[PDB]
Design a protein around this ligand. Structure first.
Ligand code: 9S3
Length: 127
């Protein structure tokens, strides 16, 4: 019926650092995923009102999208690269949870997930 507030993208109390891994996650991984033809359902939080999906935020309790991930990286929100990778993982599993095997949106998520996994397999060593 009503959308929750979007996930936090900035907290001035959180300690910050810039690493080559987080740089890679923003400059390569997110950049590549963003421009993929199937990215568009994932570029912003699910607006369950506009989409008229009253059960979405009843089923999905940890929302995540790429707009939020991107603002996180841009804000130096992430200390660990694994925080960011987990957020991409939550976004994908959210899609598979709410929707059903064989739905168009699930086929789109799957293709995005394989691209993501390929790019994280080439994640540089901390340096
Ligand atoms: C990410 C996800 O699981 N979903 C999602 C999340 C977001 C969106 C979505 C995102 C952006 C728009 C575009 N804007 C809509 C509001 C007005 C301005 C344009 C529309 C739907 C769709 C969808 C999915 N539907 C869909 C429809 C056609 C093709 C592919 C998927 C269901 C599902 C709840």
């Amino acid at each position: 019926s009503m959308n929750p507030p979007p996930p936090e993208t900035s907290n001035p109390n959180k300690p910050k650092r810039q690493t080559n891994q987080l740089q890679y996650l923003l400059r390569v991984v997110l950049k590549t995923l963003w421009k993929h033809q199937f990215a568009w359902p994932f570029q912003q939080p699910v607006d369950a009102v506009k989409l008229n999906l009253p059960d979405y935020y009843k089923i999905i309790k940890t929302p995540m999208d790429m707009g939020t991930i991107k603002k996180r990286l841009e804000n130096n929100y992430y200390w660990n690269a694994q925080e960011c990778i987990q957020d991409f993982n939550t976004m994908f599993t959210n899609c598979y949870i709410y929707n059903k095997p064989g739905d168009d949106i699930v086929l789109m998520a799957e293709a995005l997930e394989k691209l993501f996994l390929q790019k994280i397999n080439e994640l540089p060593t901390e340096e």
